[PDB]
């Protein structure tokens, strides 16, 4: 809690649905947004901050609260858009040999700034005396270790708490989330949403030699004609859907009522039957 990581993670597809099945977490409260809508929001960089506290201290990790750990080791302002993911770790962080490894900085002079890490080891000076380093009656160790033991009960067990702070500064967002996909359909007029390029057409097989850096493709006069498959490299062709004009040939409503229907621009095989120019 006095030296917590500040991992700045970016340039990834943050799939938060996977985090619900990695480890048996015991707390997944998110204050900012909902996890269902979180997978559809881009972010610049996520700050992962992890620490270990007791079971009775997990309530102290909140956007604004006092306590021995809430204002002395880690404080969260009233704008936290992440989560308070935490889980008990009483399977590998508790052995009967003396757990004099952690600490919680019981002594302090004032409340620390929210989202601040104070890596210090100087002897706590309780005023009215210059302490150049001494341990008696005026200046003591401002650090005190925990007493985590395996043969204990829940509430005073090692609980690993990891928060994921989100931020959106004046920089383009890197991490957005997981993007799904669908099976390709060929020789059929369907809709497409390839990398923002939306439209409708018949995705056919072309023989165009695209450059290794080009992704989209247009025509002589401002019309998309072919795009590159976002999956494994394949050169397709986007031709517009089946459209045409309908004309009725009629000998007149004076001898009979039989009419003929002419569809313009249709190979017949895309609607007796005759195929003319």
């Amino acid at each position, epitope marked *: 809690v006095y030296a917590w990581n500040r991992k700045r993670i970016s340039n990834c597809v943050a799939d938060y649905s996977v985090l619900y099945n990695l480890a048996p977490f*015991f*707390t997944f*409260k998110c204050y900012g947004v909902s*996890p*269902t809508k979180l997978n559809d929001l881009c972010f610049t960089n996520v700050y992962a901050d992890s620490f270990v506290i007791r079971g*009775d201290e997990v309530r102290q990790i909140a956007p604004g609260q006092t306590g021995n750990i809430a204002d002395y080791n880690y404080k969260l302002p009233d704008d936290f858009t992440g989560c308070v993911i935490a889980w008990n770790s009483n399977k590998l962080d508790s052995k009967v040999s003396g757990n004099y490894n952690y600490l919680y900085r019981l002594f302090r002079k004032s409340n620390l700034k929210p989202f601040e890490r104070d890596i210090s080891t100087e002897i706590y000076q309780a005023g009215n005396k210059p302490c150049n380093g001494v341990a008696g009656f005026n200046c003591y160790f401002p650090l005190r270790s925990y007493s985590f033991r395996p043969t204990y*009960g829940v*509430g005073h067990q090692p609980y690993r708490v990891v928060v994921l702070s989100f931020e959106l500064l004046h920089a383009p967002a890197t991490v957005c989330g997981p993007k799904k996909s669908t099976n390709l359909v060929k020789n059929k007029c369907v809709n497409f949403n390839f990398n923002g390029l939306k439209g409708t057409g018949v995705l056919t097989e072309s023989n165009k030699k695209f450059l290794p850096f080009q992704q989209f493709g247009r025509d002589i006069a401002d019309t998309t004609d072919a795009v590159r498959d976002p999956q494994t490299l394949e050169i397709l062709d986007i031709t517009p859907c089946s459209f045409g004009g309908v004309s009725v040939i009629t000998p007149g409503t004076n001898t009979s009522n039989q009419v003929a229907v002419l569809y313009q621009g249709v190979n017949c095989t895309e609607v007796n039957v005759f195929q003319t120019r």
Partner: single-chain antibody
Amino acid sequence: VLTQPPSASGTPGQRVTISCSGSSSNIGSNTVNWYQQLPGTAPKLLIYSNNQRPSGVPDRFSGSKSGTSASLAISGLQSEDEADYYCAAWDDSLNWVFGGGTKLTVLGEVQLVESGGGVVQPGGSLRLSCAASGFRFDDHAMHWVRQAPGKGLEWVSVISGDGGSTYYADSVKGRFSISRDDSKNSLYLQMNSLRTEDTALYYCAKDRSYGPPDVFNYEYGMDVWGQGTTVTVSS
């Protein structure tokens, strides 16, 4: 508030899909819990945290939390699966909203017993007792889940294993006092301002978490129930 089919149907051999709809304030920010109750006997936990299942519950049940709604699935139902299914979720407004019940009818070891009921004079009431036998009461929380005869279930109050902060329902707030003691496994719930609308069973439900179900929004559940007394005030 949770929307649940009041009385669905189904045929043997195939599978059905019981759903539970809820807003993003209760289900969107927490995990739904599915409870199964046979007609006549005490309820029992079926699915907790939407991903895991207890040791007694076989693989014949499955649950999903796609979106803001929960979906149940029973692959290969039989006559033994003819029971009431209730959805429960902890809302962010310090409350525990339960479902209505699903009549999925198809026509082809620690004891948690409690007592302290009996008909009393309206206006006032008596204390509600509870007990157990060697189950580490300090490391578990307790709930009061009453059930009117023939009606559904609803959450009354909760006490955490630490014994500090406690929460009550929207109707039993103020006039109820839940507390424990340093003695053996017990739970004391005093009721005040009786309005004669309390004909239920007052199940002394055992949980598995330690703190109140507001900070642990992924482990909160409900362990094996207990045989409750039938308190009928009837004014």
